[PDB]
Amino acid sequence: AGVPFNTKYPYGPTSIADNQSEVTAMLKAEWEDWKSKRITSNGAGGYKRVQRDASTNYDTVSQGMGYGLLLAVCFNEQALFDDLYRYVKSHFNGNGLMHWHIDANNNVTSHDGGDGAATDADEDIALALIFADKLWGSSGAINYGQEARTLINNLYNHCVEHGSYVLKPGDRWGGSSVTNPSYFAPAWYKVYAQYTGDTRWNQVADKCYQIVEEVKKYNNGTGLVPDWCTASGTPASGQSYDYKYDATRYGWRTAVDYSWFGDQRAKANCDMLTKFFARDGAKGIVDGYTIQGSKISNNHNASFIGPVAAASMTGYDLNFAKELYRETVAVKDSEYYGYYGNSLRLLTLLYITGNFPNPLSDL
């Protein structure tokens, strides 16, 4: 079970890495490292949590639980998965969605609305529960499929704007006046629709692509999406309109839709983004641009490289894709900042090596 899945995506490349046995060993070693650093029982209520790094005092965000659950199931770590999920469940809010911010001592933060949920986190948690159902089965300690079905319904009810199907950034704010393209997970939504029978999720997927289509009016042909925008693709007040540490994830979530479902909107968008990054090449990727392509920060780190490698899967240039794979492996962030980028690195490595199949496919 799990890595190596040995599966073939139905569209695009199976993998952009060479020599699978060596890749598999690399992935397992990177997982052992991530687990050692990121998983703790301290402040976890009897369970386990994903901690952030020294730079934010080893707090937890719901996003990290989503990343950790996806990683744990892909690496066939059922006991760990279950303990991580017990921590999630100990943090479901009044809407059945995870508190987004908890300190290292297991107190929800009150200054920043820590009790509210972040939609990207719960969508990743829900997807991870579907993988667990499909990989392990739901007759044990945790009924993954029931938990998934509950979480998906809460996500729809609270994190989708009624009528328009615009994805909201949380359970209790935003929608048409402010959303986050990097949260847009069309492939996840198509899985939800198929898994649960709730076809409304397909309309959410379509609306995500429509918002990015509006962004194309403003991004100068680069494929870059803003961190935050309105449903019209225009700036969201008080929120970054640049391509920074939110927006970096868009190419990853979007490329998966191409690999899993053959979505031609995903390919068009990811090809544009990859082509933009081909201007400077793999070593030239930096950690902030305006959506018209102007560099606004100049650090080369794991928050930005692997997501570009993911976008490259949709086929703009497969030679460039191989270069991006190599760069993704090569650049690992130092440990003071070792939470975010190195988590995206491992998640994107799973995908670009052929180890993130659709959980509804034959595993």
Ligand X SMILES: OC[C@H]1O[C@@H](O[C@H]2[C@H](O)[C@@H](O)[C@H](O[C@H]3[C@H](O)[C@@H](O)[C@H](O[C@H]4[C@H](O)[C@@H](O)[C@H](O[C@H]5[C@H](O)[C@@H](O)[C@H](O)O[C@@H]5CO)O[C@@H]4CO)O[C@@H]3CO)O[C@@H]2CO)[C@H](O)[C@@H](O)[C@@H]1O
Ligand Y SMILES: *O[C@H]1[C@H](O)[C@@H](O)[C@H](O)O[C@@H]1CO
Residues in touch with ligand X (CB under 6 A): 61, 63, 100, 113, 116-118, 120-121, 169-170, 173, 245-246, 337, 339-340
Q: Does 269 bind ligand Y (CB under 6 A)?
A: no
Q: How far is the CB of 18 from ligand Y (least distance, A)?
A: 30
Query: What is the rounded CA–CA span in Å between residue 334 and residue 55?
Result: 11
Answer with the entry of ligand X, ligand Y, none that 169 interacts with (C-beta below 5 to 8 A by kind): ligand X
Query: What is the rounded CA–CA span in Å between residue 122 and residue 188?
Result: 11
State CA 88 to chain mean position distance: 17
Nearer to ligand X, 278 or 346 (CB): 346
Q: How far is the CB of 12 from ligand X (least distance, A)?
A: 26
State CA 39 to chain mean position distance: 18
Q: How far is the CB of 167 from ligand X (least distance, A)?
A: 12
- Footprint of ligand Y on residues 279-298 (CB under 6 A)? 287
Answer with the entry of ligand Y, ligand X, none that 23 interacts with (C-beta below 5 to 8 A by kind): none
- Nearest Cα to 350, choosing from 271, 225, 255, 224? 255
Q: Does 85 bind ligand Y (CB under 6 A)?
A: no
Among 337, 339, 351, 356, binds ligand Y (CB under 6 A): 337
18: how many CB neighbours lie within 10 A of its CB? 10
Burial class (CB in 10 A: 0-12, 13-18, 19+), 74: buried
Q: Where are the alpha helices (DSSP H) in the chain?
A: 20-38, 62-74, 78-89, 119-136, 144-159, 186-196, 200-215, 250-261, 264-278, 305-312, 318-330, 340-352
CA distances from 256 to 64, 108, 239, 248, 269 (A): 20, 33, 27, 14, 12
Among 14, 299, 319, 334, binds ligand Y (CB under 6 A): 299
Q: Does 328 bind ligand Y (CB under 6 A)?
A: no
Two tokens, residue 348: 């994107």
Answer with the entry of ligand Y, ligand X, none that 301 interacts with (C-beta below 5 to 8 A by kind): ligand Y
Query: What is the rounded CA–CA span in Å between residue 331 and residue 341?
Result: 10
Answer with the entry of ligand X, ligand Y, none that 293 interacts with (C-beta below 5 to 8 A by kind): none
Q: How far is the CB of 300 from ligand Y (least distance, A)?
A: 9
**Residue with the CB atom nearest ligand Y in the bound state:** 299
Nearer to ligand X, 78 or 343 (CB): 343
Which residues contact ligand Y (rule: CB under 6 A)? 287, 299, 301, 337
